[PDB]
Amino acid sequence: SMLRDIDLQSIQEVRNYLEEAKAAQKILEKMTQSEIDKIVESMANAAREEAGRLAAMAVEETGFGNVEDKTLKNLFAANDVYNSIKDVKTVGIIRRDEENRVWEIAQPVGIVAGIIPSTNPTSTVIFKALIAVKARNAIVFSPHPSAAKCTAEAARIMQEAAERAGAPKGLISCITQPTMAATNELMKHKLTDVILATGGPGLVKAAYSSGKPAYGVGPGNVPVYIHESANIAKAVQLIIQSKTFDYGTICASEQALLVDESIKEKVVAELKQQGAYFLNEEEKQKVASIIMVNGSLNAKIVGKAPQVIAEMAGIEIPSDVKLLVAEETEVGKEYPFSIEKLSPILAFYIVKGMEEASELAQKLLEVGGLGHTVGIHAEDEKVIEAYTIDKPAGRIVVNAGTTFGGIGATVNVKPSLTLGCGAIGNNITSDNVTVTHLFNIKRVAFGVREMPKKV
Amino acid sequence: ASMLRDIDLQSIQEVRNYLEEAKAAQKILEKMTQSEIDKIVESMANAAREEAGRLAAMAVEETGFGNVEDKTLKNLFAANDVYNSIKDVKTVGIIRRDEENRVWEIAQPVGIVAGIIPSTNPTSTVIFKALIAVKARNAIVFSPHPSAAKCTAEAARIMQEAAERAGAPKGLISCITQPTMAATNELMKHKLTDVILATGGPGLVKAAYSSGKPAYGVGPGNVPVYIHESANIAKAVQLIIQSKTFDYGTICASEQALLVDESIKEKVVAELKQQGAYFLNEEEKQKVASIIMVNGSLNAKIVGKAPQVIAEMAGIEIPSDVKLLVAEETEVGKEYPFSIEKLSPILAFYIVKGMEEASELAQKLLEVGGLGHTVGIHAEDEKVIEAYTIDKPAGRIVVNAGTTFGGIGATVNVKPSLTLGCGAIGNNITSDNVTVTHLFNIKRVAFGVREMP
Amino acid sequence: ASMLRDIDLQSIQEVRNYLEEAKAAQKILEKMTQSEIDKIVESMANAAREEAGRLAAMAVEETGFGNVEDKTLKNLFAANDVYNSIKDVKTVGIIRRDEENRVWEIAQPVGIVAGIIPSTNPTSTVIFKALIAVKARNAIVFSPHPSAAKCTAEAARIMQEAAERAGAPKGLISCITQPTMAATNELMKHKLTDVILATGGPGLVKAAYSSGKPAYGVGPGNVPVYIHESANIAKAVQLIIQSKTFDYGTICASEQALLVDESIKEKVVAELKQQGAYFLNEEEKQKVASIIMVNGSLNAKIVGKAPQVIAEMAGIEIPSDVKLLVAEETEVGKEYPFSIEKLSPILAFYIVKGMEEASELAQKLLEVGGLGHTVGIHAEDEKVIEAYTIDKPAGRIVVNAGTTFGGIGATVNVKPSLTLGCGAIGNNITSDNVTVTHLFNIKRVAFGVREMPKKV
Amino acid sequence: MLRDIDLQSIQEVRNYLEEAKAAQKILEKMTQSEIDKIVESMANAAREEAGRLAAMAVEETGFGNVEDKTLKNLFAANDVYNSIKDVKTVGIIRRDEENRVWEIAQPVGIVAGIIPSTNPTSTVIFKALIAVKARNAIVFSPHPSAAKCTAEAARIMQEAAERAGAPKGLISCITQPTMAATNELMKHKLTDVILATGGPGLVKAAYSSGKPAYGVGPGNVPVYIHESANIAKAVQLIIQSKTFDYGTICASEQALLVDESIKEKVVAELKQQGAYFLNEEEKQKVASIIMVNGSLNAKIVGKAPQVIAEMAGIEIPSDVKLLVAEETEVGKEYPFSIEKLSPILAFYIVKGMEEASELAQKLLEVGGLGHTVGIHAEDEKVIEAYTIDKPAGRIVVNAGTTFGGIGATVNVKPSLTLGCGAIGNNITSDNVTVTHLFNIKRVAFGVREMPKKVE
Numbered sequence A: 001s002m003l004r005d006i007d008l009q010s011i012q013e014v015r016n017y018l019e020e021a022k023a024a025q026k027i028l029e030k031m032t033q034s035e036i037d038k039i040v041e042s043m044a045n046a047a048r049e050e051a052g053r054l055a056a057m058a059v060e061e062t063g064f065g066n067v068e069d070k071t072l073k074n075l076f077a078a079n080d081v082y083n084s085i086k087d088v089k090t091v092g093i094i095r096r097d098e099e100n101r102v103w104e105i106a107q108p109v110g111i112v113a114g115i116i117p118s119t120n121p122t123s124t125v126i127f128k129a130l131i132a133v134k135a136r137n138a139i140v141f142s143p144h145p146s147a148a149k150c151t152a153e154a155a156r157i158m159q160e161a162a163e164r165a166g167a168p169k170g171l172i173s174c175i176t177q178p179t180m181a182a183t184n185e186l187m188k189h190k191l192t193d194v195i196l197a198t199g200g201p202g203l204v205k206a207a208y209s210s211g212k213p214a215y216g217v218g219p220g221n222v223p224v225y226i227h228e229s230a231n232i233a234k235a236v237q238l239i240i241q242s243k244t245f246d247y248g249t250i251c252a253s254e255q256a257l258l259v260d261e262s263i264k265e266k267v268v269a270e271l272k273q274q275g276a277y278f279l280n281e282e283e284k285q286k287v288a289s290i291i292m293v294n295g296s297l298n299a300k301i302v303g304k305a306p307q308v309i310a311e312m313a314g315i316e317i318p319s320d321v322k323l324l325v326a327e328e329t330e331v332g333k334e335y336p337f338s339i340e341k342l343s344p345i346l347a348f349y350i351v352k353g354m355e356e357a358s359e360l361a362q363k364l365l366e367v368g369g370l371g372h373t374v375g376i377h378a379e380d381e382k383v384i385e386a387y388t389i390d391k392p393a394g395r396i397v398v399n400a401g402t403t404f405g406g407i408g409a410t411v412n413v414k415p416s417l418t419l420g421c422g423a424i425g426n427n428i429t430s431d432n433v434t435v436t437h438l439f440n441i442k443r444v445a446f447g448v449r450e451m452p453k454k455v
Numbered sequence B: 001a002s003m004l005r006d007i008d009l010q011s012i013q014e015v016r017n018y019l020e021e022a023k024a025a026q027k028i029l030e031k032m033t034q035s036e037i038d039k040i041v042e043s044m045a046n047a048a049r050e051e052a053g054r055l056a057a058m059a060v061e062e063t064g065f066g067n068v069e070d071k072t073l074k075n076l077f078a079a080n081d082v083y084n085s086i087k088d089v090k091t092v093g094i095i096r097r098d099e100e101n102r103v104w105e106i107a108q109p110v111g112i113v114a115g116i117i118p119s120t121n122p123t124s125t126v127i128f129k130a131l132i133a134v135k136a137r138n139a140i141v142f143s144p145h146p147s148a149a150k151c152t153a154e155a156a157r158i159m160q161e162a163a164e165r166a167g168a169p170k171g172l173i174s175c176i177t178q179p180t181m182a183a184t185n186e187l188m189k190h191k192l193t194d195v196i197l198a199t200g201g202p203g204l205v206k207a208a209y210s211s212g213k214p215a216y217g218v219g220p221g222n223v224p225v226y227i228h229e230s231a232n233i234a235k236a237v238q239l240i241i242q243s244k245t246f247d248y249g250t251i252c253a254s255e256q257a258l259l260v261d262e263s264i265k266e267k268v269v270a271e272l273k274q275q276g277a278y279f280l281n282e283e284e285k286q287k288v289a290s291i292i293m294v295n296g297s298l299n300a301k302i303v304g305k306a307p308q309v310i311a312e313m314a315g316i317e318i319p320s321d322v323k324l325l326v327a328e329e330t331e332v333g334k335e336y337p338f339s340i341e342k343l344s345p346i347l348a349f350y351i352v353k354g355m356e357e358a359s360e361l362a363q364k365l366l367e368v369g370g371l372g373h374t375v376g377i378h379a380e381d382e383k384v385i386e387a388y389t390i391d392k393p394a395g396r397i398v399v400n401a402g403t404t405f406g407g408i409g410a411t412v413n414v415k416p417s418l419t420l421g422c423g424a425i426g427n428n429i430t431s432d433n434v435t436v437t438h439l440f441n442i443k444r445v446a447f448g449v450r451e452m453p
Numbered sequence C: 001a002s003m004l005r006d007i008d009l010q011s012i013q014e015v016r017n018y019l020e021e022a023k024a025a026q027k028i029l030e031k032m033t034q035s036e037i038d039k040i041v042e043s044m045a046n047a048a049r050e051e052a053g054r055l056a057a058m059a060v061e062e063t064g065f066g067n068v069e070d071k072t073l074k075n076l077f078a079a080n081d082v083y084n085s086i087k088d089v090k091t092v093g094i095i096r097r098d099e100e101n102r103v104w105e106i107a108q109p110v111g112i113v114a115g116i117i118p119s120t121n122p123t124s125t126v127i128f129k130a131l132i133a134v135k136a137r138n139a140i141v142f143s144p145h146p147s148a149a150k151c152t153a154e155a156a157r158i159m160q161e162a163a164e165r166a167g168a169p170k171g172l173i174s175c176i177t178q179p180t181m182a183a184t185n186e187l188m189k190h191k192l193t194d195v196i197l198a199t200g201g202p203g204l205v206k207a208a209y210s211s212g213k214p215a216y217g218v219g220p221g222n223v224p225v226y227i228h229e230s231a232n233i234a235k236a237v238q239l240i241i242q243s244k245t246f247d248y249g250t251i252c253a254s255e256q257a258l259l260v261d262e263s264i265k266e267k268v269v270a271e272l273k274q275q276g277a278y279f280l281n282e283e284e285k286q287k288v289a290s291i292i293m294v295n296g297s298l299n300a301k302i303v304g305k306a307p308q309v310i311a312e313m314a315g316i317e318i319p320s321d322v323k324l325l326v327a328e329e330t331e332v333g334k335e336y337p338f339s340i341e342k343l344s345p346i347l348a349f350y351i352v353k354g355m356e357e358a359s360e361l362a363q364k365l366l367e368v369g370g371l372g373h374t375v376g377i378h379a380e381d382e383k384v385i386e387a388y389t390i391d392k393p394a395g396r397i398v399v400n401a402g403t404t405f406g407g408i409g410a411t412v413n414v415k416p417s418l419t420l421g422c423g424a425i426g427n428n429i430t431s432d433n434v435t436v437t438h439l440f441n442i443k444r445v446a447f448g449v450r451e452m453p454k455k456v
Numbered sequence D: 001m002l003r004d005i006d007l008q009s010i011q012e013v014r015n016y017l018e019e020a021k022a023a024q025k026i027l028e029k030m031t032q033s034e035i036d037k038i039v040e041s042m043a044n045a046a047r048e049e050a051g052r053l054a055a056m057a058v059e060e061t062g063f064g065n066v067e068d069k070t071l072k073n074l075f076a077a078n079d080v081y082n083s084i085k086d087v088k089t090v091g092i093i094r095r096d097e098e099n100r101v102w103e104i105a106q107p108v109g110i111v112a113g114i115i116p117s118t119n120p121t122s123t124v125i126f127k128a129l130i131a132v133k134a135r136n137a138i139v140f141s142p143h144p145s146a147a148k149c150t151a152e153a154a155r156i157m158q159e160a161a162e163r164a165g166a167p168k169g170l171i172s173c174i175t176q177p178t179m180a181a182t183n184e185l186m187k188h189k190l191t192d193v194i195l196a197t198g199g200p201g202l203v204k205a206a207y208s209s210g211k212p213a214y215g216v217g218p219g220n221v222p223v224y225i226h227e228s229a230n231i232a233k234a235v236q237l238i239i240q241s242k243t244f245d246y247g248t249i250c251a252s253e254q255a256l257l258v259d260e261s262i263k264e265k266v267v268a269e270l271k272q273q274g275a276y277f278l279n280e281e282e283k284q285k286v287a288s289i290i291m292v293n294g295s296l297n298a299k300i301v302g303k304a305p306q307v308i309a310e311m312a313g314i315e316i317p318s319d320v321k322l323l324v325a326e327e328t329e330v331g332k333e334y335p336f337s338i339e340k341l342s343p344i345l346a347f348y349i350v351k352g353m354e355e356a357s358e359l360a361q362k363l364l365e366v367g368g369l370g371h372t373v374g375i376h377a378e379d380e381k382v383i384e385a386y387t388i389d390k391p392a393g394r395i396v397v398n399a400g401t402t403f404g405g406i407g408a409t410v411n412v413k414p415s416l417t418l419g420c421g422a423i424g425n426n427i428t429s430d431n432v433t434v435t436h437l438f439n440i441k442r443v444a445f446g447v448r449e450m451p452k453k454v455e
Ligand SMILES: Nc1ncnc2c1ncn2[C@@H]1O[C@H](COP(=O)(O)OP(=O)(O)OC[C@H]2O[C@@H](O)[C@H](O)[C@@H]2O)[C@@H](O)[C@H]1O
Pocket: C119, C145, C146, C147, C179, C181, C184, C200, C201, C203, C204, C300
């Protein structure tokens, strides 16, 4: 009669972590800015040394992507995120407004529950560990099952690096054998203060039903408009690099191109030259047959090199092909090329001008991309202003790859791997989530006006 | 063939009718210019201002809470201060450009807002929520507390009518007429509900963060106020009494306990009595205590009641000019009724040796249903203020002001609001005074500025 | 359907109305004499009889299952056999005295009954449940299957109107006109509902026993029939074909697989063919197999359809005088469409070496969605019958009879019923054929006849 | 409270059900004679341990007294055993040759047995006997305040059963009772039937479990003393029943209804046999401790009168056998009109049979519907008239309702699980016994031809 079952063991595990995190966070909350910053620096530096190994671990365990790109993915969290927060004041009085007689104090949310995706398992741990601790919180991680080990390993490195710099034990922890029982327990336990839910909509929904404050994400289905004023060579190059990054595993990555008829041929030609393989009618359907199983995305094509996809669909492509492209006209969840494909596959739509492009992008976003990301390539300022203004996306990327743009690598939004899709994407915010979401502001404010007694 | 009858089913259908009309209304509204929106918002605030007294009378009459003068002032806070704080906010289209970084921001409405309305601030809260929601280009559907169903609906009606006159679409502002759990649940989980603004007790707030929907909740207050020996006592007492006795203590943020430095105790007692306080003796105390808590929870019947009314209920006898009741206290806990949030002109009175002992009791008082809400201190020595305030878990830390008027942003520079988020510690997504910027998302147009290695 | 969106609210409100009306009617009914009750029930059985054909034709027309001749007989079974088995049952006041034990028994109506009706037996099940419920002095509120809403509703009206002509109160018998989960949920959990009679799919029955109310549910059948080498083969095939093809196989207790001794295999095949069975060759079997299941369960579109219609749907070709389809089979499981409950004129045909192998296989077939329901055997060796039947988990173990007519108590002496409890093993509170004695509680008046001791 | 008691207790239930699964399959294979030998050995051990369990039960729960609990245990060991020992439960139990029908006994499988706080050890014995006799396994769940004595009772049963051939795991008991465990037990895949002897909350839960269940209801038994009653004999019978184990059995007298014409004699006779009639001052003090919050006060359950008196702060002679209180009102807020589970008796004056019936009806609606009523009378025509319209499964004539209700002194089946029929949310009004724990399979021969066509 000692606990034997995995659901039950995992609950016990979560409970221990929470007890230890509470005690750890109390200690951490008392430290100075400089004490905190030394801990954060050690972690980022630690992430930097292990970024390649963890990248390789993630590739090995998940079968997604490639080692070089995941290595770069880890460094983004270890470098860019770190740089974006290292100088942020998170301790004590963070703002004084002398003339209005008010000052702001940073206040930790306490204990954070972090849900980690399979696609970005190691990098997402870092990004969250960094911003959480910078704000003086504890954090308990819940991995995607198919990536439990490398995720846990990423967490370990953060804790141990933190500890070397003086952090208490249990500040950073991770469920080692994920279960439904464990995920529910973590989200709802009284000691759990805030949920960062980076996962599919089902899990994000559970988080907004948890009784707890939650920052969730939504899925992407990013349409990109190439206007006839675009630098076509520059645009095709930027897109391919982004689309093929880690073989297209991030959710802000391009899923469909929308192209002005008048430059249609040039863009096609530029694509082919730079490594695109245009599928013919025959090949499309074979590839389409493996894109969706049932009514949802086939997991076996996710983050797979184009040669692997070619073999799987039983077609032959040159070994130097960087991405597959299929010309399409229809949009809907029964047309596999119009959905989010999370792989080096791109749909290709022709448009008459700005209006048909907008109309189509909206159609594409209505398919599970709402509030996430859109892109346009164009040199005409009036067209850019008119196109972007009414698009339902928190990230509207101009003249950049959307993968790198969406996360804040190559455009100036805050570096993040947790992209809020706003209310339209069932989220409390459309922000790239960062350290400022993980502390509350307290306002010390002085009597400055007298309240009237009579009307 | 076609019948209905049970009130719950009718209330559910009503909610469904409102949301549909709200959707259509918001889409038409969303197409309006900043100028057109701002005119609509202006009309609402004007009408609100004029009807403040009438609405105040209905709420006092329907609920039994408070008095018409203070409720009139309360409605005006919403019609004036809240309006003034949002009327110049950019909410249409591009609201910000960052030329050096090559980014610009577009305001995006959340869609349809569900506003839950408490029984204590029923008309003022509708006015406040309607202004910030419509300014952000949303529709809003209200759910009254049952004790205040009629006046709440009337508040909504006045806004819709004021708004529509100024060009707003039909169905933009609506209100459930007979509140039920069924109807509340429908409003919270429905496909058309985009965001919940939940201002109410801990039970409703928990339900809102369990709805599957993005939510801004509140928490309850239990506001402790420290009077330091450096304080201007005569000025502190006056601010305290005006705040505590406002609308007879019905706002979540009213002082509930005074922590007083031993060294000035004598002047404070004398000063309280002179300014209208009645100190209950321990016999009077046990008797008043007997009606504060009822197995279990705060006795609704003393809520927002005049001190003479409360005195009669307890079976004690007090002078007219008496403005509030005070009880001496040493203990803190659910088993000590004078230590809880009382929502009435009743104060606890604790003696402390100094700041360190003051913080300890205050911490203990907050953990009884006040965490993350509001705290107060009266003092003139700036170092004592900083040391005391730095570690208090409250989104509002009010210095040298009444906490009623401070917490809502009337008399201290916090954002005008009647929905006070209590941060993670109060089970809320934010610690801000909720206002117009919380009801639109920002979309970012951002340009390529760097190469990837 | 301008307001069809709120059908959930309408259906709920309607249920509340029906239950309130039911409460008043039953209070009144409970006061009547045995003569009055018995006079009413009789009128209901008589009206059902006259209307048997018209109801039969509505059900066939509305649902597309079955045929008019057989449904007429199904309706008459409820109107005649069920009625006759209950006509003398005492349900008012003191129903039994036991003078030497100094006990007598007083009958107590359960109150208001919630009746769930299947699409396969919509009119006949209304008739059966109405007769036994009212005989026991209860009110009953019906929930139709949505595919069968109109004919079900019509059956209830005929019972109620016929009841009124013989003196019954209004609202005694009612029926939900717009079936919904919301309404079903309301009906099962509502304050005034006392007992649930759930004759429907497994999800609906499980829900009934999750309702907080006492419930009599059913289970599905997957009836295996053993033909032992001692069987009268000519007689058996006749009984089997009649039972299996009745209403085109919609009756759960209908045969689903034959297990045939290897040693007599040649005669059975020949007799089956002569009496109207078509043996599918291996390829015909696959095309028919491919329409048996859609999405991991039975395809509703073949249910209760004529053999020629099934043939057309599968794209195969059979004579017009074929009465049922038969396929040779070796495997058992959900992945073997011929091994599941087919609810249509289709039979599986398994060869077995002897009794012990039949029993192994019989257990396996039941485990695929048939536990506690029905099994059959045809044999003339009493020892073999006894050894085979003894350990089968089925409430009805039918010997030398069609299992359709046997299961329900038409041709064997079990209680006449269209609600077949599958016992604990089938997730039911009883394995009985549900009947009138299940719809009233017994109160016992008992006299002190013994002394409690005072010291140990 | 312990943080992880719930998970280990869930585990224990799971282990028990799985051993019970294996054990029952083995038990089910035995002959009638092997089963009957087992049941007899169980009865003997219950008989031998009656006193030791009684003492444990009194001490752990604070309810009742050791002599009566010992008698209570012996009722289960003897009366129940004797009433079932000759019932056939294996194989063919009946052969109707003219009608051509064989009946075969079929065990329900695994029973979940919920045990009340009032009759912990006696109920275990009772249920273990009828469950095993019908060839089932059973897993018990105690009320937490009686966990140790309940488990001990289960332990003795299994060991008694084992010596005579039973398999291990046949009879088990949750040692750390919890909601989680109870919940796990009622809904578990391996659970076949729930026997729910407990409060109204749990019975509702059992009928909400998705499983077949036999529940009980609460009692609130009114007994009418008609002018035709033998007053001396009636009072003697009533006091014996009412004070048995200090009134802990559910079907215990709670209110007397007395004909005005014999009021005088009855009051004096009650007094003569040890009743103490409370005055207005005493009434109000006692009434104050009968319920706390708006539910029955656990501190008076099964307590001697003197203990109750002291608790209410009144004093009474040490020889007082029961407290009585004259009453006119009926309702949830009149503590003397509700079920008191202790030696307190309401006393109602009535003008005749008709007023008595109305009041009886009102008392039953206060949590006694379907359970038990009593009447003392020698007038045959009144009894018949009084009893016919009472909604109760046990209608006891000229006997104590405690012993009548359980089937000790009137001829209902000896039992400690009393069903309240449909009117009390139960599938039966029977005293539950062994025939409720096996289903009947019917072997039925062809006796008719079906005609294929109608006119
Ligand atoms: N998973 C389930 N959960 C809850 N209830 C269910 C479930 N499955 C069936 N039911 C209950 O039974 C009814 C639906 O049963 P069906 O499975 O649909 O009956 P069936 O005859 O097998 O199929 C016919 C119906 O299904 C459709 O595919 C077909 O077009 C037709 O409407 C409903 O009234 C419902 O209460």
